[PDB]
Amino acid sequence: MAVYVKFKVPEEIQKELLDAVAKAQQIKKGANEVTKAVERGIAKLVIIAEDVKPEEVVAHLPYLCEEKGIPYAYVASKQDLGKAAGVSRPASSVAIINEGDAEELKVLIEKVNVLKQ
C-alpha cells in the first residue's frame, strides 16, 4: 500500500465512507481545499483515496488530521471518491463539512477510530 496509507479500512466501511460523502450537504474536494478545511477546524471527517500519486499531494493529511483532532480514513479508488463527491473524474481527498445525517456520521467516525487504533 502507498506510504501515506496508515491503517486498513475494510471494503464494507469504504462503502459507508463513500455514502457519507454522497449524502453530505457540504464538502471540500482536493488537497488544497481539504487541507484548508482541516486547518480551519471545519472538517468533520477526511477521506483519502489510496491510489493517489505523487506522494506529496496527500502525505501530510494523516498527520495534520491527528494534530487537529479531526478523524480521517481511506477508500481504495480516487475514481470512486470522485464519483461520491459528484465528479465524473477522480478526487484525491474529500472533507465533510456539513454531513447529511449527524447520527450516522458519529457512528461511522467511531468505527473508523476503532479501525485506526
Curated annotation (Swiss-Prot):
Keyword Secreted attached: no
Gene Ontology MF terms in the entry: box C/D sno(s)RNA binding; ribonuclease P activity; rRNA binding; structural constituent of ribosome
Location relative to the cell: Cytoplasm
GO CC term, one of those recorded: ribosome
Keyword annotations: Cytoplasm, Ribonucleoprotein, Ribosomal protein, RNA-binding, rRNA-binding, tRNA processing
Statement: the UniProt record of this protein carries the keyword Oxidoreductase: no
Disulfide-bond pairs as recorded: none
HAMAP family documented for this protein: Ribosomal_eL8 (MF_00326)
Subunit field text: Part of the 50S ribosomal subunit. Probably part of the RNase P complex.
Function noted in UniProt: Multifunctional RNA-binding protein that recognizes the K-turn motif in ribosomal RNA, the RNA component of RNase P, box H/ACA, box C/D and box C'/D' sRNAs.
Family per record: Belongs to the eukaryotic ribosomal protein eL8 family.
Protein's name according to its UniProt entry: Large ribosomal subunit protein eL8
Species of provenance: Methanocaldococcus jannaschii (strain ATCC 43067 / DSM 2661 / JAL-1 / JCM 10045 / NBRC 100440)
Species lineage: Archaea, Methanobacteriati, Methanobacteriota, Methanomada group, Methanococci
